[PDB]
Amino acid sequence: VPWFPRTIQELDRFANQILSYGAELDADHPGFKDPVYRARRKQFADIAYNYRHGQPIPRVEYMEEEKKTWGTVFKTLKSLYKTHACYEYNHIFPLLEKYCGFHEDNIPQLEDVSQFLQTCTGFRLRPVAGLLSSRDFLGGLAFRVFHCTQYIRHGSKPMYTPEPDICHELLGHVPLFSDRSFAQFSQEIGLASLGAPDEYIEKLATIYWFTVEFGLCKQGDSIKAYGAGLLSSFGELQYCLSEKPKLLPLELEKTAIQNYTVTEFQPLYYVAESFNDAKEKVRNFAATIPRPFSVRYDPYTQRIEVL
Amino acid sequence: VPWFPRTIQELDRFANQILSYGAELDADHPGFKDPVYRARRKQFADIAYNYRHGQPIPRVEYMEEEKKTWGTVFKTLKSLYKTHACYEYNHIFPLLEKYCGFHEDNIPQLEDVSQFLQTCTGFRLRPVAGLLSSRDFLGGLAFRVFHCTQYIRHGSKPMYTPEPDICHELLGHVPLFSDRSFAQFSQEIGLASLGAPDEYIEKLATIYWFTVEFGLCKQGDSIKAYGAGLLSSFGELQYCLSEKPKLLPLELEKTAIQNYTVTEFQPLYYVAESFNDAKEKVRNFAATIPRPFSVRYDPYTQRIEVL
Ligand SMILES: C[C@H](O)[C@H](O)[C@H]1CNc2nc(N)[nH]c(=O)c2N1
Ligand SMILES: C[C@H](O)[C@H](O)[C@H]1CNc2nc(N)[nH]c(=O)c2N1
Ligand SMILES: N[C@@H](Cc1cccs1)C(=O)O
Ligand SMILES: N[C@@H](Cc1cccs1)C(=O)O
Ligand SMILES: [Fe+2]
Ligand SMILES: [Fe+2]
């Protein structure tokens, strides 16, 4: 089996092995070419590389343009959440607002955010230079660690970015990580991925993608978005609930092998019977991943136990 | 029911509510009268009072006399452990020696000790000014927190002290707290005590006293000491295994109501069939303590959940 981390400190081993969605040379996303943007990303990358388990996440200062982007993103999404975001999400957001500083004119500092999550569900942030492989990100959820970015998307296209910027992490992921049920849900699938065969991790990731990332669900006689990827892009947040996208019932045996895109709006979304049913399905599947052993995380010593 | 702490930070509420065994005006223990001793204790008390959850335990410097006391205590007990200490204890001690600095000429710093315990079983130290009530100390074990003292016994009588000095904490308690089975054992009885009726807490304490504090057990065709109170006093460590003390089989229905002393060697010890049987008995009893609810500690958020 593939070597997996046993300690929360061993995350650094595979930590900062950043990747990309290959949208650089994409004429659809000129921002990446911005030399100022790249230098900025180089600065945040160094903070992630000079970071090690234990220390508090270094606080930083953002440019005028970066604050503007967050202001546009934040104020636009907040207006969409009222009619597009699922119930669970909308009842948690206010907490971040009054207890974490989530505001139109204030980009939250990761340290404060990580502290907020610790007292909520035990989750904690870990600054990373960029995109991580599904295996590493998923593995980190076993320790209730969320590898999070500090840089913000290019101000030219605040409606959507193919990369997982700070807007995506904080506005799409953090909110549900402060929920106990969702937090334990996230850790379980993360534990199942540990040392799991590559073929199952990718199936897992695909399911994660069509649920946690771009999942859709119907509450009552309506339909809302619950996926981080939808909750952080006011661009396709409008689109995921229009008539353009194709909708299908959530079915693991079909969703696990479905194709998706990483540099554009999804042409297809899976609708779950409910946010709850969505979690039920993933767990069952996750608990189906074969492997020559079992594992258990010890929250006291912060280590993985191989049964 | 009595108000009990829900958070590991709420320990400070009832923290530093130090007490005493009333051995001050005792002509058997002149040390307490030493004005130098008292001033010293006043200094360690201030560190405990100016301490708050989170911060690392302040490192201190000890006097020549204090180092001498620790040297005498340590080197004498280490020689007795070989034939008096139980198996579990003797196989753990070496770890503290090479990984924590437990040496004849080096009084361990609480911070390093607390760090060592975190990586072992999740336990952590919390500096206190002196003796705590059974209810508070026991309650702290629910969060895997061990309220520990920094001062050392008076150099005039290193063979025995009625107070729980640093020698008692580190040489008698810390070693077994680094054991997983014993660590979970300690936390369980601590959880049972939370909000429990006063009458049961005192019965619990009495049992704790005749087991964790001065418990004796027979491994193979021999008998060893496993109680913290015996493992930290080379004075009655010799005595608990001589013929002077009275020995009786460990029986909760009889041990729970037995009388004991706090300023002298115990005139009676209870022998368990084995260190393992000792734990079994206490747990069962602890799980017998009635109360209009149930509780569960969440290691992720570090809070008590009232079922
Ligand atoms: C597991 C799945 O691939 C998911 O999209 C992961 C991938 N890598 C990531 N990397 C970082 N830094 N942040 C994320 O939110 C993600 N999402
Ligand atoms: C629970 C039982 O009373 C036990 O002897 C406790 C009492 N108070 C204590 N207080 C401190 N500071 N340290 C200890 O080891 C103890 N032992
Ligand atoms: N496209 C999303 C970001 C990501 C979704 C999934 C991975 S990154 C948005 O612009 O916020
Ligand atoms: N009498 C023990 C100390 C304590 C035992 C029980 C509470 S304090 C010794 O001298 O180390
Ligand atoms: Fe994501
Ligand atoms: Fe003790």
From Swiss-Prot, chains A, B:
The pathway that the record names for this protein is: Amino-acid degradation; L-phenylalanine degradation; acetoacetate and fumarate from L-phenylalanine: step 1/6
Q: Changing residue 153 to K: reported impact?
A: In PAH deficiency; severe
Q: Could you say what the effect of mutating residue 12 to Y is?
A: In PAH deficiency; severe
- Result for mutant: residue 197 to H: In PAH deficiency; severe
Impact upon substituting residue 94 to T:
In PAH deficiency; severe
Q: What effect on the protein does mutating residue 152 to L have, as reported in its record?
A: In PAH deficiency
Mutagenesis / variant outcome for changing residue 173 to Y = In PAH deficiency; severe
Effect noted on mutating residue 221 to Y: In PAH deficiency; severe
Effect of substituting residue 278 to G: In PAH deficiency; severe
Q: Tell me what the record says results from residue 126 to Q.
A: In PAH deficiency
Set out the biological process GO terms recorded for this chain's protein.
amino acid biosynthetic process; catecholamine biosynthetic process; L-phenylalanine catabolic process; tyrosine biosynthetic process
Keyword set, alphabetical order? Allosteric enzyme, Disease variant, Iron, Metal-binding, Monooxygenase, Oxidoreductase, Phenylalanine catabolism, Phenylketonuria, Phosphoprotein
- Outcome of substituting residue 125 to F: In PAH deficiency; severe
Tell me what effect the entry lists for residue 278 to P.
Answer: In PAH deficiency; severe
Q: Name one GO cellular component term.
A: cytosol
Q: In terms of temperature, how does the activity behave?
A: Optimum temperature is 50 degrees Celsius.
Q: What is the effect of changing residue 54 to A?
A: In PAH deficiency; severe
Q: What is its EC number?
A: 1.14.16.1
The record gives the effect of mutating residue 124 to C as: In PAH deficiency
Q: What is the effect of changing residue 277 to A?
A: In PAH deficiency; severe
Similarity field = Belongs to the biopterin-dependent aromatic amino acid hydroxylase family.
Descriptive protein name: Phenylalanine-4-hydroxylase
Task: Identify the coding gene.
Answer: PAH
Shown residues within the full chain: 118 to 424 of 452
